[PDB]
Design a binder for this molecule. Structure first.
Ligand SMILES: CC(=O)N1CC[C@@H](C(=O)Nc2cncc3ccccc23)c2cc(Cl)ccc21
Ligand SMILES: CC(=O)N1CC[C@@H](C(=O)Nc2cncc3ccccc23)c2cc(Cl)ccc21
Ligand SMILES: [Cl-]
Ligand SMILES: [Cl-]
Lengths: 305, 301
């Protein structure tokens, strides 16, 4: 019993974290095989960030300008190239702790674990979701750039995020491991703002199924609804639309609990129009949307890595 | 900016997780140097579980009855001994991935990371507090016994918890790494119940300071309170009493934010009286008590 916000075991990723220094800027790099990936803004000073020409800045750099440190060992940079907003530093040594890995781009609503690092040293691990406005509500201080988000599938690490910046509202923005930003963000010192966030509906339903599996049933009702009537109500409360794919993905939890997805949507519809009325669900007074249906199945069934 | 429930990186502990099998029972062990630590209830035949005599059961066991598996390698048990509710299986191989470590017993209110495991394989990592009633509100299934709680403050792993059992209310009980249970619990199937839980007041105050550091100020008020008046109100909401030690520990956050501890205590009294009125503090509609003053300073700097 119990339900916790749970991250993947971070060990396979800790063995990849390195410190990357370029001039006065120090941030984190991800060392996989003989390449170190890091945000390209490491090559920028305070003025450069205002309006940077990264191709122009990178051409002026030499391999010896990048100081890569893996533990107490300095790695020697033998090449440098840029892929979108990520810098790739070729090193002479392949990381012996390189796990089986893939670079994957995730969709909004998908969750991942963040290994927050400072000076190439892992300091914490937390579970979060890619918000529908493409930001992440992370916990990051100065020096956390280059920290990565990942999932684990069997024995393979799927790297899905690299931290680049913090928006004025305290939310965070970054890229996939190919340097493509999630969201309409740029890696510049300019006025940027996240769009109005919405609730990840399929995740709320998955979390309501986890609450039922844990014995919390007060919100269940006799009612069902159509996907169309639910979506009309949900859109009014700034909830993301629920697609037939989402209904299908919730199938196993629906079968395990005996509550159909449209039956659970009728519970969710009431929860929105009436509130919790002093009650909680899994110790929470708000509907939690950072657990995907797969996260719920993994936790409520004990999948190991 | 931002505030998250954050666990320590679990790598140093993953390299220590092994599977321990004794008869039909399989659970997790912690492999440090040439010793594997695990709950002593692994030697019980479920029929012994109501009133087990563990000294009697352990004396009947031989080293070849314990099957220890580290990854795909079977370790050879060359000795067995018991320290309180923990079984120590001496193995013929020192764990090469043994980190710098210590065994620490924690107090209620303290937080730690849990590496939940099944069959010696880590499946997830999360953050807990030792509740004032000495239970932990974990997420554990059958087979999670032997999963450990830890803190990793600078290079060294401090092991503070080993999971032993789930109480009838879904909460969890376990021991320190010396086998001493936290709380009035025993490793028997006898009727056991956790005491009524209370809120860790010092942690709520620390979290209110984290919210102020993050720009949340709506709950602040012009009032202050005596420590005794605060405890009288707090006890009525099933909040733990706040001692002078707790006031002292909140000193650095008080200095950083410019809000005296008793000034923040008056905000907390108002929050308990009115509720949040549709507002959230750090994205939460409830007062969070699983961040210690030390966690807040470490996370916020
Ligand atoms: C203004 C500026 O030049 N910066 C700052 C450094 C950097 C940045 O956002 N860093 C931070 C990341 N994560 C949490 C942070 C909490 C506090 C401070 C900084 C954090 C950055 C990166 C880009 Cl791509 C664009 C702009 C900026
Ligand atoms: C009742 C009983 O004989 N058991 C069960 C096995 C075991 C126990 O609590 N196991 C579990 C742990 N953590 C979550 C669990 C969720 C579901 C099931 C079992 C879980 C145990 C350990 C002791 Cl020390 C005393 C009693 C018992
Ligand atoms: Cl999803
Ligand atoms: Cl402040």
């Amino acid at each position: 019993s119990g339900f916790r916000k749970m991250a993947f075991p971070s060990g396979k990723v800790e063995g990849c974290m390195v410190q990357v220094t370029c001039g006065t800027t120090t941030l984190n790099g991800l060392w996989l095989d003989d390449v170190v990936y890091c945000p390209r803004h490491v090559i920028c000073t305070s003025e450069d960030m205002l309006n940077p020409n990264y191709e122009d800045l990178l051409i002026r750099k030499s391999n010896h300008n990048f100081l890569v440190q893996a533990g107490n060992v300095q790695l020697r940079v033998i090449g440098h190239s840029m892929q979108n907003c990520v810098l790739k530093l070729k090193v002479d040594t392949a990381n012996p702790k390189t796990p089986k890995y893939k670079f994957v781009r995730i969709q909004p609503g998908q969750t991942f674990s963040v290994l927050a690092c400072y000076n190439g040293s892992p300091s914490g691990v937390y579970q979060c979701a890619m918000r529908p406005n493409f930001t992440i509500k992370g916990s990051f201080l100065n020096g956390s750039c280059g920290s990565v988000g990942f999932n684990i599938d069997y024995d393979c690490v799927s790297f899905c995020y690299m931290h680049h910046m913090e928006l004025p509202t305290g939310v965070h923005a970054g890229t996939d491991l190919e340097g493509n930003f999630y969201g309409p963000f740029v890696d510049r010192q300019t006025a940027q703002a996240a769009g109005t966030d919405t609730t990840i509906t399929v995740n709320v339903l998955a979390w309501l199924y986890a609450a039922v599996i844990n014995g919390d049933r007060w919100f269940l009702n006799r009612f069902t609804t159509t996907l169309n009537d639910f979506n009309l109500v949900a859109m009014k409360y700034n909830y993301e639309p629920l697609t037939q794919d989402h209904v299908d993905i919730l199938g196993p939890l629906s079968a395990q609990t005996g509550i159909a997805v449209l039956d659970m949507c009728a519970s969710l519809k009431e929860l929105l129009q009436n509130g919790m009325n002093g009650r909680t669900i899994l110790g929470s007074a708000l509907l939690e949307d950072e657990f995907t249906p797969f996260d719920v199945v993994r936790q409520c069934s004990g999948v190991t890595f």
